[PDB]
Design a binder for this molecule. Structure first.
Ligand SMILES: [Cl-]
Ligand SMILES: [Cl-]
Ligand SMILES: [Cl-]
Ligand SMILES: [Cl-]
Ligand SMILES: [Cl-]
Ligand SMILES: [Cl-]
Ligand SMILES: [Cl-]
Ligand SMILES: [Cl-]
Ligand SMILES: [Cl-]
Ligand SMILES: [Cl-]
Ligand SMILES: [Cl-]
Ligand SMILES: [Cl-]
Lengths: 133, 133, 133, 133, 133, 133
C-alpha cells in the first residue's frame, strides 16, 4: 500500500448488510466500481463506462461500522480502455480499543473512455504521458 | 439460454441509476452476487459466503424500467467451493411497443459452503450427485 | 400453485424490516404492485397505472433472508382495466437445514392500460384472445 | 376530512418514483400501512401486526415534491382486530404559485393487537370505551 | 410546545440507524431540513433553498420505532431570508406499555426564498403580514 | 485547505436529490456528521455520540455526479467533548471538460467521548497531547 490516498472513503452502515449480518458484498462492489471510475477519469475527465471486472477477491468480511477506503492504481491504458486495480481496506476498532486496518477486498476493473453522450473517446496522449503511459 | 428459470427477477428503479442516467453497475453486481448465492445454496442450503468474482462483462447498458432476470449455472464444485456463471437479461419495451430481451451482463462468481456461523462446510456428495458432480 | 413462473423474485434484506424485526409489509406490497404490473403489461406492453388493490391478506410473517417469489394471474380484463391476483411465497431454511416454502401474502390488484403519456388505452382484442379473454 | 390531524406527514422524494416518473404506489402503500398502525396502536400501544388491506384506491397520481399527509379513522374494533380507514392527501404547488390539496389515495387496513412477542392480545374494554366502542 | 401541528411526522425505521444502533443523526437532520422548509415555504410557496443551520442540539437518542414529529416556528423574516426553529419529539412505548413523548432534537435553520429556477425572490409583504411580520 | 486528507469521500448519486434536483442538504449533513465523528474518534477510538451542530453554511449547491470530500479539523477538546470543523468540497467537471473544486458546505460539530455502551468517557491526556491539546 502506497497507491496514493483513497479515491473513496465511506462508513459501512447497518442498512448495508446481508442476511448473515456482514456488510453485503454488492455494496462493496459498488464502492469498487465508483472508486475505479474516479481513477479512470483522470485519463478521461468527462465520463467513463464500466465494461468489465476481473480478479475480484473477497479476502475478508466487512462489518458494520468499518471505515472503508478504496485505493486505485491505473494498471493499463489502451486506445479507449482503462484498467484499474482497486484495493479495499477496512478500518476497525476492537473491544479493547485497538484500531486495525484490514485489506478486505480486491478487484481489477476496466472502463472505456467516452463522450458525455456515450461514444468512444480516444484517450489523449498527454494524459497518458503524465500518468506514465 | 436454457439454464433454468431466473434465480432473481427485479425491476430496475429510477433510484438505482448512476450519474449518467443508466442503471448503476454496482446495483447489477448486487443482483449477480445474490442470484449466484441462491444457485450455490442448492449445494449448501444453510449459508454461502462470496469469495471471488471473475469474468464479469458489462455487455450492454441497463435502463430505468428494465425487468432484470438473473440466470445461474453451477459450473464447478470443489470440496467447499462453488462456481456459478450468472447471466443477466434486460426485458425492455421500445417506443413502437416492441419487447426486446437483451443479454446485458455476465459473471463468474465463487462461493464457499459454510455453517450458519461461518466455518467451512464440506459439500455433501449427495447434493453433488443430484447436480451432476 | 401453477400460475406460471414468478414475475418477481427478490431476497428480503435486513434493510427491509419493520420496528419489530419482520420484513416490512410495505416492502412486500411494493413487490406485489410491481409483479402485478408485469403481468398486466402482457395485455398492455407500454405502460399500466395501478388504480386499486383489494383482498390483500398478510397470511404469514416474512423474515430476513427469505427468497420472495411473486406469482401472478390475470383474473379479469375490461375495456381498459386489468385485474391480477398476486400470490407471494417465501423460501426459507430452518436450523436443521430444511427448506420450506410458505404462502406468505395475497392480493388482487387492478391496473389501467395507458399510453406512455398516461391516457387511457383500450386493450387490443388480440392480446385478450391469446390470454383467454 | 375532519378525521383529526395526520398520523404521518412526509415529503415525496425523487428516489421514491416509478419508471414512469410518478411517485411509486408501493411507497404510498408503505405510508398507509405505517399511518394505519399508529392509529391502531391507540387501541393496542405495544404492537400491532398488519393482517389485511381492502378497498385501496389510487385516485390520483403523486408527484415529486408533494407533501403527503396520511389521515386515519379507526372504523371497527373486534376482540383482537382493528380496522382503519386511511386517507392520503398530496399538498402541491403549481407554476403560478397556487397550493392545491388533492385526495390522492385511500385504503382500509386491518391490524391484530399483539404482545411485543407477537401473540394475540385481547383489546382492553377501556381503550374501546374512550374510542367510541 | 404549542407551535402548531407537526410539519413532518415519520416512523424511525431499522434502516435509519448508526453503527451503535441508535437512529442516525443525519437522518434526523434530514427531517429537520425538510420540516423547516415546509414552514419557510408558507412565506415563499414555490421554492426555498437551505442556506444555514445554527444551534442544533441532539438532546436525546432516537430509537427504532419512534414516531418522530417535527415542529416549526418561523422565528425571523428578512428581505429574502427565513429563519425557522425546528423541534423534534419522539413518541415511544416502554416495556410496561407506557407512552412517552421526548423532546429529542432542536435546530435553527435559515432558508432563502427563491424562484423555481433558484434566483432570489423578495418575500411578499402580505405573507409577512399574515405571519406576524 | 491543508487540514489533512479527507475523512470521507463519496460520489453524490441521483437518488440523493431534493425535489428541485440538487443534492439534498440532509444527505450532505449526514456526510458531515460521519466525517466529523471519524475525526473526533482520533481522541476517542471506541465511540462518540453527536451532541450539537453550529455554524453550518450551505455555501454552494451540490449536483449529481460531484465527488464530495469531507475534511475535518478538531478545533477544541474538553474533558469529554470534541469540536470539529468540517469542510465539504465538490469535485465537478463542466461541459468543456474542466475540473473544478468548489467549497460547498461548512459545519462545526460537537461530539462526546463515550464508552461503547454510551457512558461519558474522559478523554485521555495522551491523545490530547499528540493532537496539540
Ligand atoms: Cl455477501
Ligand atoms: Cl454507464
Ligand atoms: Cl456504472
Ligand atoms: Cl458473508
Ligand atoms: Cl409491517
Ligand atoms: Cl403511474
Ligand atoms: Cl406505481
Ligand atoms: Cl410484523
Ligand atoms: Cl449519529
Ligand atoms: Cl436546493
Ligand atoms: Cl435541500
Ligand atoms: Cl448515538
Amino acid at each position: 500500500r502506497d497507491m496514493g490516498e483513497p479515491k473513496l472513503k465511506i462508513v459501512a452502515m447497518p442498512s448495508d448488510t446481508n442476511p448473515a449480518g456482514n456488510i453485503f458484498g454488492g455494496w462493496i462492489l459498488s464502492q469498487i466500481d465508483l472508486a475505479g471510475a474516479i481513477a479512470a477519469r483522470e485519463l478521461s475527465p468527462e465520463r467513463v463506462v464500466t465494461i468489465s471486472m476481473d480478479k475480484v477477491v473477497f479476502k475478508e468480511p466487512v462489518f458494520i461500522g468499518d471505515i472503508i477506503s478504496c485505493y486505485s492504481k491505473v494498471v493499463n491504458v489502451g486506445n479507449t480502455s482503462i484498467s484499474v486495480e482497486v484495493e479495499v481496506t477496512a478500518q476497525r476498532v476492537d473491544s479493547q480499543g485497538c484500531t486495525s486496518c484490514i485489506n478486505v477486498t480486491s478487484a481489477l476493473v476496466t472502463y472505456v473512455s467516452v463522450t458525455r453522450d456515450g461514444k468512444k473517446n480516444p484517450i489523449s496522449e498527454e494524459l497518458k504521458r503524465i500518468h506514465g503511459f
